[PDB]
């Protein structure tokens, strides 16, 4: 059962005519809540169901002040307005930790999904990282990894040849390993076709994120102790 630690909670703040209203929120869930068509409930976003004047100092808002500003004193009705119209306040440590966390996740997600369209091959994480530096990418502490991946990809595509692309790999493995390979495959992609062979081996066509071509081969080879054949489809 999930909860934001009080250490990890951030503040969402809304000011009206010089008066602050603040709530303590899970930063990941708060970011999701801000997205279009999110299924995250406000109850899951809030660390406590209380509206503060100052959330770090613990001074809380009057019901009268909330009614004046929001036309409601219900924290579950006030909070969505603060989240959608307000700002996010981070401590120095939180900003540093969040940027670092998201930076690594962005590098990995790009490395996983991307290929070099010139040769069809993956870019190692280190290459993506180097491109981000060249493009002087600033990672945001708060924006979701999903949103930032697209921003960052656009920024680095002038530095390196890069595109998100799924690829299809045909694999051939001994029949004894087919059950086991299904489990490995499910970490990497989706089986689009599979056929037991006349000779007892098993062939599967697997659609994977293009940046995983080498990792996929490595895991399959380790599983089958080298008893695997792979090729890119066509």
Numbering used by the authors: -1 to 232
Give the article text.
The Methanothermobacter thermautotrophicus mth685 gene, which encodes the homologue of the Shwachman-Bodian-Diamond syndrome (SBDS) protein, is located in the predicted exosome superoperon. Mutations of the human SBDS gene are associated with the condition known as Shwachman-Diamond syndrome (SDS), an autosomal recessive disorder with clinical features including hematological and skeletal abnormalities and also exocrine pancreatic insufficiency [OMIM:260400].
The X-ray data were collected to a resolution of 1.75 Å and the structure was refined to a final R factor of 19.0% (Rfree of 21.6%). There are two molecules per asymmetric unit (A and B) resulting in a specific volume (VM) of 3.2 Å3/Da and a solvent content of 61.6%. The model contains residues 1–232, except for residues 33–35 of the second molecule (B) for which there is no clear electron density. Surprisingly, there is a substantial difference between their conformations, resulting in an overall r.m.s. difference of 2.5 Å between the backbone atoms (residues 1–232). Indeed, the high overall r.m.s.d. between the two molecules is due to nearly pure rotations about the hinge regions that can be defined in the boundaries between these domains. Thus, keeping the central domains of the two molecules superimposed, the observed rotations for domains I and III are ~13° and ~29°, respectively. In the crystal, molecule B makes extensive interactions with its copy related by crystallographic symmetry. Thus, we conclude that the biological unit of mthSBDS protein is a monomer.
